[PDB]
């Protein structure tokens with residue numbers, strides 16, 4: 382028992398991380414086979430990047446992998462990422478995929494500086510397409526990922542911090558999550574909402590682990606739930622969400638709509654000085670998959 | 683900016699994890715050079731382990747590292763760990779140390795099943811010498827660790843779960859943390875307390891990241907603080923703790939005893955429906971070292 386914010390083991394990604402330097406800009410890159418992926422704003426000197434990049438040569442790009450120089454032999458830009466062709470394939474390249482995730486989905490972030498991994502933590506992609514990360518100067522190019530058996534699914538590359546202290550980035554094909562652009566103009570996070578289906582998953586985690594104090598006799602309809610959810614800035618729960626919570630519902634003997642009735646009263650009454658899984662707030666950064674994985678024992682290798 | 687429960691990158695430990703099987707018991711072991719460390723309760727059939735172990739032969743022990751059989755060529759017991767000599771040294775052995783940590787200190791746990799890493803999370807050793815982990819059947823032998831530049835300091839090996847759902851284990855030389863013994867009798871966690879110096883560190887993290895609402899005009903003496911701390915089940919703050927919080931005090935311009943005055947009013951008044959660093963509880967599982975590392979950028983390789 383117990384329940385923690387669990388990240389995936391990070392070794393498979395650590396072996397891919399490199400330092401990319403050109404001009405006076407140094408950031409992190411991701412070395413898979415003979416390509417290094419990194420944010421395009423590494424390009425020298427409001428910008429027009431196509432114009433900026435036709436002006437660069439290969440030898441402008443310094444790529445360090447450990448104590449080893451990597452030689453750039455080609456380059457191309459795909460949306461907001463730069464792809465640098467190197468003369469050596471990364472022998473530690475794991476089995477991998479690039480995937481663009483939906484808001485509400487979680488991932489592990491390997492925070493990196495100068496191509497050296499610093500820490501790992503778990504995140505979710507917020508409904509407003511930001512992530513509440515932990516990032517300092519030089520972290521751009523750090524990636525977010527999930528692991529399925531042996532396969533690393535990369536889903537995030539870090540680019541910028543917004544005035545409110547949250548973080549914006551791209552998929553590994555360089556498309557921003559959300560409306561953000563890679564220029565230092567004026568952008569803000571849109572208003573965020575709570576990921577309802579994730580909150581329900583976490584309540585099921587609590588029940589699996591022995592917390593029951595918040596359950597009740599009542600039930601509710603999907604529609605009447607959503608009426609109370611919208612009031613408290615929660616995302617609507619759809620029938621797909623209900624279906625996803627099936628296995629957890631079956632393991633605990635609590636109908637999904639019954640646990641919705643429980644959430645309803647938690648929202649209307651507060652938690653009255655009790656905790657759930659060591660939290661005095663309703664937690665929304667565990668997916669139904671996350672809960673099942675941590676409470677059944679799923680490994681990866 | 684941002685502040686997360688950050689674990690160390692786990693790759694260096696992943697490369698050491700193996701499966702140890704003997705009789706009908708299978709658990710995790712830690713392969714460093716030509717020795718595999720694992721909990722001694724892997725020994726077959728209230729127990730006298732010296733008597734149990736003189737009855738075993740080397741070929742009784744099946745060690746799997748990936749798809750590779752490892753041959754046991756010697757064995758010895760040191761306190762509550764078994765040390766199995768194998769005919770092959772682990773080529774992925776990192777630079778390492780074994781260290782016995784003090785309560786209040788944090789570490790990363792790489793949760794493992796059948797020698798396969800499952801997830802990584804951050805923990806603290808509680809004042810009562812338990813850890814609030816996340817562990818299922820088969821996780822014994824998973825280790826906890828810290829990283830200093832290139833060196834892995836192993837400090838924990840997982841052994842048991844206690845009735846309250848918290849976890850007990852040993853250092854890597856096999857000495858239990860706390861009064862616990864490796865037999866299935868009747869043991870309970872002693873009463874726990876909050877790690878005061880860690881709470882203060884986290885308040886400094888909040889100030890570094892821009893939260894200021896909890897500061898105040900007041901100050902306090904060490905003695906009068908401890909008088910209020912003891913009331914709320916907080917550990918006494920010593921002058922060593924004060925000295926440790928020096929650098930954080932200097933970076934923020936807030937005298938340690940001034941931030942103690944702030945904590946005092948937080949304890950007496952509650953948080954009044956505000957949050958600190960996304961938490962509605964006072965958090966105590968970040969050390970002063972943890973805060974500085976995450977808010978200055980310290981990497982490891």
Ligand SMILES: *CC(=O)N(C[C@@H]1CCNC1=O)NC(=O)[C@H](CC1CCCCC1)NC(=O)[C@@H](NC(=O)OCc1ccccc1)[C@@H](C)OC(C)(C)C
Nearest residue numbers: 422516517518519520521540541542563564565566567568
């Ligand atoms: C590359 C990098 O390390 N990084 C991550 C940042 C650094 C600190 N924490 C992080 O997560 N990104 C940046 O430093 C980028 C670099 C730019 C990106 C666009 C292309 C040119 C290079 N800068 C930022 O993240 C800015 N954010 C920003 O300009 O947002 C747009 C904006 C500007 C003004 C008003 C509103 C919105 C950061 C560093 O600046 C602030 C002040 C927001 C923290």
Ligand SMILES: *CC(=O)N(C[C@@H]1CCNC1=O)NC(=O)[C@H](CC1CCCCC1)NC(=O)[C@@H](NC(=O)OCc1ccccc1)[C@@H](C)OC(C)(C)C
Nearest residue numbers: 723817818819820821822841842843864865866867868869
């Ligand atoms: C090896 C292993 O995986 N593991 C970790 C446990 C499993 C579930 N979560 C975990 O962290 N340890 C055990 O399963 C051990 C095995 C014993 C250890 C002692 C030597 C013989 C093998 N068992 C337990 O952890 C027990 N705990 C226990 O007996 O505590 C003592 C006790 C007993 C009765 C009353 C009070 C105190 C667990 C599995 O049993 C409970 C019911 C407490 C969960």
